[PDB]
Design a binder for these strands. Sequence first.
RNA 1: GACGGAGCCAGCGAGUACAACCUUGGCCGAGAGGUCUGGGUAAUCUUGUGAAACUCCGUCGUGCUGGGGAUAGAGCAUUGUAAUUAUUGCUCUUCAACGAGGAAUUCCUAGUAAGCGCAAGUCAUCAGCUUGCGUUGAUUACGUCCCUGCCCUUUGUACACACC
Lengths: 70, 106, 117, 123, 145, 143, 53
Amino acid sequence: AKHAVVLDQDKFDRIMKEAPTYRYVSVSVLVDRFKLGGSLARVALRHLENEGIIKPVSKHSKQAIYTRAT
Amino acid sequence: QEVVIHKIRINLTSTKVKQLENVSANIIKNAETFKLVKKGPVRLPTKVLKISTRKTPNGEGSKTWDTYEMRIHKRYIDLEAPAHIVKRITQITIEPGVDVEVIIAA
Amino acid sequence: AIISKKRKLVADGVFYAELNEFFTRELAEEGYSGVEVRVTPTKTEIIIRATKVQDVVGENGRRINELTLLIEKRFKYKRGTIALYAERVHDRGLSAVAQAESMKFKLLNGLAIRRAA
Amino acid sequence: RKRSFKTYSYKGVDLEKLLEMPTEDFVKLAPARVRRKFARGLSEKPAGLMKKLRAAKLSAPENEKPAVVRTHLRNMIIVPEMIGSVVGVYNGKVFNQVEIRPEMVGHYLGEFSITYTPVRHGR
Amino acid sequence: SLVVQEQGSFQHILRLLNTNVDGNINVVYALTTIRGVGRRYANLVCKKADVDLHKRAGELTQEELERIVQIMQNPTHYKIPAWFLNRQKDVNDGKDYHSLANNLESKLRDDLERLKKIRSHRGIRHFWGLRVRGQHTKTTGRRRA
Amino acid sequence: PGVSVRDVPAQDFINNYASFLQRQGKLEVPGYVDIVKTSAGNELPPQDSEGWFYKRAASVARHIYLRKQVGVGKLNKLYGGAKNRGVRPHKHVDASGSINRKVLQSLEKLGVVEISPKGGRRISDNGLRDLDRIAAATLEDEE
Amino acid sequence: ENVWYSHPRKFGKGSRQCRISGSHSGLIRKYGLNIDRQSFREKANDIGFYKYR
RNA sequence: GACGGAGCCAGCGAGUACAACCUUGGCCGAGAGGUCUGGGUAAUCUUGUGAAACUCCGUCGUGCUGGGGAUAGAGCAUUGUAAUUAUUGCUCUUCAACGAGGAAUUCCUAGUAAGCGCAAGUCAUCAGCUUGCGUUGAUUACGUCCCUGCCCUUUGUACACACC
Ligand SMILES: [Mg+2]
Ligand SMILES: [Mg+2]
Ligand SMILES: [Mg+2]
Ligand SMILES: [Mg+2]
Ligand SMILES: [Mg+2]
């Protein structure tokens, strides 16, 4: 185990703040930025994916790529 | 007075293909001369019988292997006919090597 | 009677081989070369080629009949269902087996080997 | 005292029940192999050997051991009808002595004999 | 589907049945860390308890834990067929026995002792320190115990 | 025009079927559900515990619809695969024998599957209608 | 004439005899041939067997 | 990647009447399997051998870990008179060595290498093996004698049982 795969409110808040004005919104990228796990990242994305903000490019399993609203 | 159609299958099995073919041709010619409704010399997947063996009697050399194969040729000749005519045909129509066999009835 | 066609053919081949071997063994003095099996309904013809056809024949129905009986005993078939004919081979010189047999005979009796060859 | 150590049971049955059940009951309360064997045709397996064992039991000097019953059928299963008797299991050379205990229940005769010598040089 | 929030309603890093249950693992495959506790068996236990397979191992209500423990002790009292056990129909007692945590090892030891006492081929092999299931060692495993 | 049934991209159809089954509540659960490996080449049952058997059933039904006289053995073969044999290489062993049978029975009970002559199973007419409806729904979802 | 002069030899390499030598060694049971392979590899040509590929 | 699902695709095969074959299809068994009816002395039935590898979604995300299933206990079966020295089979468990392999060197120039199964040979029972056959399917040469082995020429030889 290498940690940073918890839950928390602070983490959620951080995630919320880290969404607009970014080139990549990918699971791997998220993991790299020392955030939540592979499945959790997707969930987080989904929660922000209600009224624009983050929009998909690829829908494939374990190779998902999303980008900001232009 | 008779003439009751049974529909008769003729089996032609063998190895030496040329002979078999000749026999088939002969049969068809005979059918033509007695003038009958008939399905042709229907050919089946010519079964190969493979027996693969170490060439060595005793297992001391390089691992040479030989596939001894037996080519088989299965032929169906279907006749729309009574039995008497078939019997007449099968009085002759036998050539060495080739198996002549009458299945009889549909 | 009746098996799978392939199997039947294989069995027939084996039978032929066996017969050939027997003739090589039994008809050694008779100068045998080849067997020519013809299987028809009821009467199965068995042609046999030899150098000394007279020996094979015997004195009208001697050895040949015995051989027929033996064959019947071997393969369950009845009297009349197996027929045996003994024939002259058309020039033995081209036939290798016959030549080999002749050579063997020459060797066994007592003769020069190289010269015989 | 009321219970001696712990009851040496087959599948929840005491020695008061174990010694008196015959073969069928043992089979019922046994590993599958034994059952299978019972199912297949029995001849010359429990024929004379069993009789010999019984004779030994009868002719025992009391409290002491019965006579050692020699077996070639080392593929035989140990049944609680003859606990206490000594069996001479054949290995090619020497019928070797084996005790029949309250814990040899439904095991094989061969697994207490061994033909070859155990390994030397180093364990 | 949703991230589990709150400040700290459920406590991380657990200790259940004489051993340790590490968090950050989803339900089942932290219970495999327990000596003897199954995969399929674990799943069955979870089902019996009535827990979702989305929670973390570093969570769980106390009541739920108690229920799980109860399930572990007796396979017969709850809806478990119980032929997924270390001792089914059994070698001595003749019931339904799937040993738990630090007890399985003890049971194994006892069995070994029994085998030794009997002096079966297997027992002999064990004593020697070799190969039980007719496996040959002419070539393989040249260090051993 | 014409509402098609085969033209559905596989998984969606199955999902729809599952949803329908969930809505109805009429199937009769085998009972040995979750206490089973489902495949002989399995170390884990279905991952989502409850459900997934429904999906399996749906898949079976779809296969039946596609083909002619279909039986238990064939189903087993279908839902088998590769065995983790450790040191030994993989073979091919089939699915659990009874579970598929149970599924078939359940389908028969609901009226999706009918018994065919010669040896196997086919589709009931009400069942066919239901399948068609499901397909239509799926199409609507897509369109 | 002795009473016990046969083992239960229903199968195995024992019951399986060759058609020429009677060997229990390398017996092509296939196609109902029952020959020790070596002999076959000599007689095969007459048995109708040939090699092509 | 792993595990579930879910999708779903070959080609060689071979297989009984005087027997103990290949065996569908249906009820009972979590498996393993059994049983009643078959069909096939075989392009016709097992069989479209609905094989694996592969392709979609979710769950766990670089931990000797859910990678890996190795030493092992327990039942039920099955084969065969006979299974202990697990024949084999599946189920729960235990869950180790092994984080891309040192010196050497094997194989290969296209449906070739490698992967992935199937079938036959075996065979009462067993596959990790062989033969075969498909199924995915590239890198880099398209050369040269440097190494290895052979080959021929020219050379020398006191060897010709020939450099052991
Ligand atoms: Mg793997
Ligand atoms: Mg086919
Ligand atoms: Mg582990
Ligand atoms: Mg082998
Ligand atoms: Mg000089």
